[PDB]
Design a protein around this ligand. Sequence first.
Ligand code: CDL
Ligand code: CDL
Ligand code: CDL
Ligand code: CDL
Ligand code: PEE
Ligand code: PEE
Ligand code: PEE
Ligand code: LPP
Lengths: 54, 124, 230, 100, 73, 75, 141, 152, 100, 62, 93
Amino acid sequence: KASTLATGKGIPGIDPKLPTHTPPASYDVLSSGKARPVQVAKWPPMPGGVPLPK
Amino acid sequence: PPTRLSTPLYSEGGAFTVNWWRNRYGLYSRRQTDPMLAEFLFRQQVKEWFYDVPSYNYAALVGLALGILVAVIWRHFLFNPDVYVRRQELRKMWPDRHRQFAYAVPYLNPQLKNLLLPYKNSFI
Amino acid sequence: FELNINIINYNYLGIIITVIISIYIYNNSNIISVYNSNLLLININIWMKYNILDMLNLNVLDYKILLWIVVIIISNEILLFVSFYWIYYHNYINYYHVNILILNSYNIVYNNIILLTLLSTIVNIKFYNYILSYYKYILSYLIYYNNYMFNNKIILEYKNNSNYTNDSVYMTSYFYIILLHYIHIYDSIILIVVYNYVNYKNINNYYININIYYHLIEVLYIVISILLYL
Amino acid sequence: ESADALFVGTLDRLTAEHPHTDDPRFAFQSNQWNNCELRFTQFCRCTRELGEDDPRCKYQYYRAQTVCHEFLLEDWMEHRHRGTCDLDIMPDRQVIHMRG
Amino acid sequence: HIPHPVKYVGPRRYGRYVYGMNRPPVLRQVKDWIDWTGWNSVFGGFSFQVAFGLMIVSGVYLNNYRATHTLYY
Amino acid sequence: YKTENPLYKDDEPFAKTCHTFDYTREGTEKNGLGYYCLMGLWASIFIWDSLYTGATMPTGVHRYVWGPYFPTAWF
Amino acid sequence: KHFFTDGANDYVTGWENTPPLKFPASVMKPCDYSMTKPIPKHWKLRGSGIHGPENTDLMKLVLWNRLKQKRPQREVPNINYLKDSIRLELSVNWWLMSCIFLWGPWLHWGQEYQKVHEQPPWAMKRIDGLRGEGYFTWFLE
Amino acid sequence: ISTSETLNQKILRWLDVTGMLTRWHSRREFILDMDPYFRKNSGMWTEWERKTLLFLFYCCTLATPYSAYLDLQELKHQGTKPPRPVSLESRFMNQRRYDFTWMHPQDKFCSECRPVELECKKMCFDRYRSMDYRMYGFQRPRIQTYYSFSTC
Amino acid sequence: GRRLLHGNYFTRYLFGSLAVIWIAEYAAACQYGIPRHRNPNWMWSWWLEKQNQIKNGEIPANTPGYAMVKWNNEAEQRWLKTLNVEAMNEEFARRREAYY
Amino acid sequence: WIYVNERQREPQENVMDHEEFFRDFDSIYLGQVFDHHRFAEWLARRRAVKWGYADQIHIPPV
Amino acid sequence: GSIEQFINLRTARMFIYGGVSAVFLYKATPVMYRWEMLPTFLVKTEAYKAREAMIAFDNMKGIVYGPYDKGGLEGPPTKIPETSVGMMKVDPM
Ligand SMILES: CCCCCCCCCCCCCCCCCC(=O)OC[C@H](COP(=O)([O-])OCC(O)COP(=O)([O-])OC[C@@H](COC(=O)CCCCCCCCCCCCCCCCC)OC(=O)CCCCCCCCCCCCCCCCC)OC(=O)CCCCCCCCCCCCCCCCC
Ligand SMILES: CCCCCCCCCCCCCCCCCC(=O)OC[C@H](COP(=O)([O-])OCC(O)COP(=O)([O-])OC[C@@H](COC(=O)CCCCCCCCCCCCCCCCC)OC(=O)CCCCCCCCCCCCCCCCC)OC(=O)CCCCCCCCCCCCCCCCC
Ligand SMILES: CCCCCCCCCCCCCCCCCC(=O)OC[C@H](COP(=O)([O-])OCC(O)COP(=O)([O-])OC[C@@H](COC(=O)CCCCCCCCCCCCCCCCC)OC(=O)CCCCCCCCCCCCCCCCC)OC(=O)CCCCCCCCCCCCCCCCC
Ligand SMILES: CCCCCCCCCCCCCCCCCC(=O)OC[C@H](COP(=O)([O-])OCC(O)COP(=O)([O-])OC[C@@H](COC(=O)CCCCCCCCCCCCCCCCC)OC(=O)CCCCCCCCCCCCCCCCC)OC(=O)CCCCCCCCCCCCCCCCC
Ligand SMILES: CCCCCCCC/C=C/CCCCCCCC(=O)OC[C@H](COP(=O)(O)OCCN)OC(=O)CCCCCCC/C=C/CCCCCCCC
Ligand SMILES: CCCCCCCC/C=C\CCCCCCCC(=O)OC[C@H](COP(=O)(O)OCCN)OC(=O)CCCCCCC/C=C/CCCCCCCC
Ligand SMILES: CCCCCCCC/C=C\CCCCCCCC(=O)OC[C@H](COP(=O)(O)OCCN)OC(=O)CCCCCCC/C=C/CCCCCCCC
Ligand SMILES: CCCCCCCCCCCCCCCC(=O)OC[C@H](COP(=O)(O)O)OC(=O)CCCCCCCCCCCCCCC
């Protein structure tokens, strides 16, 4: 299984080593070293992603 | 027509071909009991019937006769005023069958009648 | 070695059956006809006995020969119904505007379709058991109940109908087409009453014949239902 | 006073002015049985609206005679007089839509 | 006849029945059964009635409602 | 050892001989897209005939932006 | 399948034109000697040469077709075969379900509507004064 | 009530009062329910065949009560069929060339009545009875007999 | 295992044939220009006018058609002797009061 | 047995007067579906009157 | 702020699903009533009452003793035949 190119080596999905998708993994600290802030929403998001003033 | 079973027979793809015919020829056969014998009998029938030149003439005739037969049957149902399949007009008295009467005049004047009627003077 | 076919030299049922047929013509009482019909049933059974005894010949083509005979018989039954449909539709232009009450499209058609569908399901289960070399006693009695209801419903319908064969060609064709179907239902009773388990199984022509015949009757009713009720 | 006046108004008018010629609705077929039934039904309806004495309905009967043989008309007229002619039954007393 | 694999991809065994424990939801079970025995029989069996029912019941709008609102006289 | 459940094995192929059965190029195994298009057209004609009763009796007034010999006029 | 065919659905005798694919070609093979190489001239015909049991493959085909008729266990077919064997049975059963649960409800609804409004819900109401239910299959009018 | 089981288990148990669900879920219970002669062949069945057979069998039996209900309603409908208007004898209605005697070629009962015209036969049987000739039928009120399907 | 017919032959040739029949019929109607609007009513103009009068209330409800014609057959003359529309309407009115 | 059992019973009132039916079309034509118990009792009384045994029978109330 | 505490995904699948269902019943119930789809025992439509008010079970006219009405001024026979009088086997009252 996926031993040779004919068997599917290097083909994502068919090859066990390669995943079908490569979504970024989650992290608990920012690269700066600050803790990642957490925001629990209770209303739908803004129509255009417009941020509100501080 | 090959004479050696080793030489394959050319076949096209579709619903009426050499391969299609081979699959179904021996379905009801008690004589095609093994590959060698089955192929020999299959090619024997194909050679005798499909490689016979005059046989194709009858194939044309059956096609023409059936084509006319289907057309006349279909034309009566579709266009003949006297033929009823729907029931709306049959539930009314004759004077009220307006929709059915629409077929009358056009059905009375087919193209061929107009073309050939002027040739009555070849007889009278 | 042996001959390919074990020839049958003599037979005397043919004379008896033919004479039984003649008795119908030469009767002076309808009571003789009733008893004559029993004789015909007896002698036909003897002929069926000869077919079962022919199994001793161990001839592979016997099954095929009888199966194709049934196919021809089925075609004749279909063509007989076609003639009745032909008769019905020839006078189609004279229907639906005469002062007669045609049948309703709600009650009779639905229950009959449901009832006859159950009959098909019972026979299908019989075929499945025959494939599996298995038997279920209750199945036969479901058919008898099914046939009992069909007889009870058809008898009442004829008696309570307010129009008669002499009223119009429409009524004649309705009654005749329905009777022709009933006769074929009754012929099914004649066949199914002997259903049993035989241990030689899939070389028994009776099972395939019954499955084909019951399917034919039911499909014919669908055509009748569309023509007359719907 | 128009060339196509016959067709205008009704297809009926065509044979009302030319009684002995083919009717447009039944010209395609040699069998004229349906033509006779339509003519008789027209006569029956005329009497209901106008009455027998009206000259119009008298002519409608003549039109029926042009295509209906007398042995048919005598029988059908007998049924009409009794009140059992299925053609002349009043619409509110028809049974065609009953029980299906 | 064209040879082809078995298309059933659902679970092949639920395990021994133990008073109906550790078994899938009922709707999932119905879906598995039809997958196991073939959807072709379901579609073929229901096709005739669906076609007839839709044609008849469509007349509620096509024949009855539309006609009342669409009569030029 | 390792085994395969017989119920989920694939169909056996036809034997390859002088007399070989082959249905691969026939295209008769299942109804194709063309069949389902015919069904779609039948539904459309059924609905269309009921919805628009006057379609069979079309209007005779002809109005063309680019005349009657322009392709869009023909359709 | 229900119907018996000598070629494919031969359940009366169980004859098969070719052996199972399980056997190696050395053990048993389909009877095909169309590819036999030309016979050397110095070889002499000993047997009849007639197609029949003198050929090894045909002899093994006849032998197997008789000795296969006793087997210790069932040769289980795949689900595709089992589906095909009862295709009609399953489809008729689903047709019965459709009649009960689809046709029945709307047929009952139509009769109830007909009671109140004199005509089925899928029919144009009449204004001609005739009484009765009228047609049922509207599209055949 | 029993609290030793869940509600689902209780419902399944009662639906299993005849053992249908138990035979479905146990091959052993199914084969032992066969008679000994046919149990001999049970070993060859696949589970697909066994359960598929039960599914077809249960659908058929479960549908039989529904058909019976329809038939009973049909019998009740025919038992109290509303009267219909007497037919007006139209142009081509009630044409006769000869009397109806094909049912009784020699006896010729009810020659004027049609084969299944019950009301005509009833009055015809009454004449025969008044002539000292017995005839069977049409004498018991429908509401005083069993299986009439006409009782209130 | 070898196939003789189309894999889906039964459904293919039943629905397929019905589809072709329906589509052919629509084409035939277009070529001949047949009106496709459905009328479930009789087209007798005089009768339809009388029915409208009943709906408007000009003619009393439940009045028979033979009570409105200018020529009556024998059977209708028999019925006219026992016809009482006024009594029939009162009886219907009484039924409504009892029901409500 | 089905035939014998039914033959004993008096026939149902198959038809009635043409004009009387239409003068009460709604009640007769639709009576069964609206109330089959009362409709069945009504039929029984008519059969008793038709064959002249009304005074000899006591029709149960509905 | 004081209402944010009451949004808990159950309240959002009980308000959103519960709300759409209410609209469906509010807009569909009148249509079912008009088309006689509602159960009769639950409620009777005005059209149902109008038809039912016209039904009675006390009409004893139109009894005839013939299968056909042949027209004329006499009509079908209306008098029971003498031979049929007293031919019914009625259980004792
Ligand atoms: C009967 C059966 C019915 C079945 C019902 C089934 C219901 C299913 C569940 C429904 C649940 C809905 C709520 C869930 C939350 C919203 C979804 C969400 O957040 O998804 C993530 C989605 C994206 O998430 P994200 O990607 O993470 O966010 C990144 C960005 O920041 C944000 O992303 P973005 O930057 O991409 O932008 C978001 C979005 C912005 O969001 C929206 O646009 C939301 C629109 C909502 C409209 C709702 C109201 C209109 C309908 C009214 C119906 C009335 C019916 C009356 C019935 C009467 C009966 C008698 O913008 C776009 O997507 C761009 C759209 C571009 C196309 C616009 C085309 C407009 C053409 C107009 C032409 C007109 C011409 C003629 C002139 C006409 C003048 C009038 O979030 C959003 O879209 C954010 C905005 C959400 C707003 C929700 C508004 C809900 C309003 C409810 C009103 C209820 C009123 C009740 C009245 C009283 C009742 C009795
Ligand atoms: C607390 C108790 C609660 C009880 C509730 C009621 C339950 C009643 C169930 C009746 C089901 C009858 C189904 C008939 C089709 C054929 C069945 C079949 O294949 O049997 C094979 C079975 C065994 O055949 P096998 O060949 O030896 O074995 C074949 C298989 O290998 C092995 O076969 P298998 O074992 O797989 O068979 C499976 C099953 C396959 O069939 C089914 O599962 C179908 C189930 C359909 C349910 C129908 C329920 C109907 C209830 C309607 C009630 C309406 C009330 C209205 C009220 C109105 C108010 C105004 O077959 C049966 O189990 C059939 C019934 C067996 C009973 C036999 C003993 C005599 C009758 C005893 C009745 C006791 C009733 C007590 C009531 C108490 C209530 C508190 O056959 C027999 O046992 C011999 C023949 C007798 C069977 C039919 C008995 C009919 C009894 C009807 C009772 C209900 C009457 C309701 C009248 C309502 C009037 C208003
Ligand atoms: C619109 C809504 C309403 C619709 C209403 C519809 C009404 C339909 C009414 C039908 C009445 C029932 C009839 C069938 C009852 C049995 C049903 C049954 O058991 O089915 C399941 C079962 C399925 O079999 P299976 O082996 O399990 O198949 C498994 C798979 O399906 C896969 O199987 P496979 O594909 O692998 O193949 C194996 C199987 C496949 O076969 C079947 O399964 C047959 C299925 C047929 C079902 C019915 C469909 C409708 C057929 C219409 C045919 C029209 C013919 C042309 C008419 C032209 C008119 C101008 O082969 C056989 O079983 C062979 C059977 C023997 C055939 C003999 C044919 C003889 C006539 C040949 C044509 C003659 C004219 C030649 C003209 C040209 C001359 C140059 O069918 C049978 O086993 C039945 C075979 C025994 C009965 C055959 C009856 C033949 C009658 C021939 C009449 C010829 C008349 C010629 C003159 C006409 C013009 C004057
Ligand atoms: C802005 C405006 C927007 C507007 C939007 C408007 C929206 C409109 C929506 C319209 C939607 C249209 C959709 C069209 C495309 C359809 C695509 C499709 O799927 O087509 C294929 C689809 C199914 O075909 P298929 O894909 O080939 O089927 C797959 C099978 O699984 C193939 O597999 P198989 O071959 O293995 O199948 C099993 C097969 C396997 O075969 C075997 O096992 C071998 C043996 C076969 C031969 C059997 C011989 C006989 C058997 C004996 C047993 C009989 C038992 C029953 C006995 C009964 C006794 C009474 O066995 C059977 O199937 C037969 C045995 C089962 C029982 C047979 C029962 C009797 C059948 C014959 C009678 C039928 C008529 C009955 C009538 C009622 C009762 C009288 O075809 C249809 O569904 C037909 C199309 C219908 C179109 C109707 C169009 C008009 C209606 C429109 C309604 C909406 C309008 C609303 C108003 C709108 C106004 C704006
Ligand atoms: C969170 C969302 C939840 C949504 C839930 C939706 C539930 C919808 C439930 C719909 C129930 C519909 C029931 C209709 C039954 C009609 C029965 C009927 O008419 O019976 C009579 C008729 C026979 O009567 P006759 O007098 O003989 O007349 C006809 C022949 N002459 O018998 C039958 O029709 C028998 C067949 C019964 C059909 C039962 C249909 C049940 C449908 C249930 C649907 C459930 C949907 C659930 C959706 C959940 C989504 C989350
Ligand atoms: C015989 C009557 C049976 C009634 C059955 C009712 C159920 C309907 C469905 C099954 C039957 C198929 C017909 C369906 C028709 C649907 C459309 C429709 O209503 O068409 C009506 C229309 C005509 O009705 P009217 O308008 O009243 O007449 C106008 C002037 N003549 O009918 C038709 O044209 C179709 C009827 C014929 C359909 C069958 C096919 C005809 C051609 C057969 C050819 C036979 C020869 C061999 C063919 C070989 C093919 C490989
Ligand atoms: C132990 C005893 C068991 C008895 C019960 C079980 C066995 C049942 C056997 C099957 C019975 C099948 C009967 C078939 C004939 C049915 C006759 C029938 O119903 O005919 C009437 C029906 C409708 O008529 P109307 O009364 O006008 O309908 C109005 C509705 N009120 O149709 C007809 O009239 C057509 C009659 C056709 C009868 C054909 C039967 C065969 C008769 C042949 C007689 C030949 C006699 C000459 C001498 C040769 C003798 C062979
Ligand atoms: C003896 C009498 C028998 C009964 C009468 C039968 C008469 C008709 C028989 C026809 C053949 C039936 C089987 C057909 C099988 C099938 O579907 O066959 C399907 C095939 C496609 O095959 P595959 O998809 O399987 O490859 O379809 C075709 O070849 C033709 C149908 C496709 C759609 C055609 C479109 C027509 C367009 C018409 C104009 C529309 C105008 C619209 C304007 C907006």
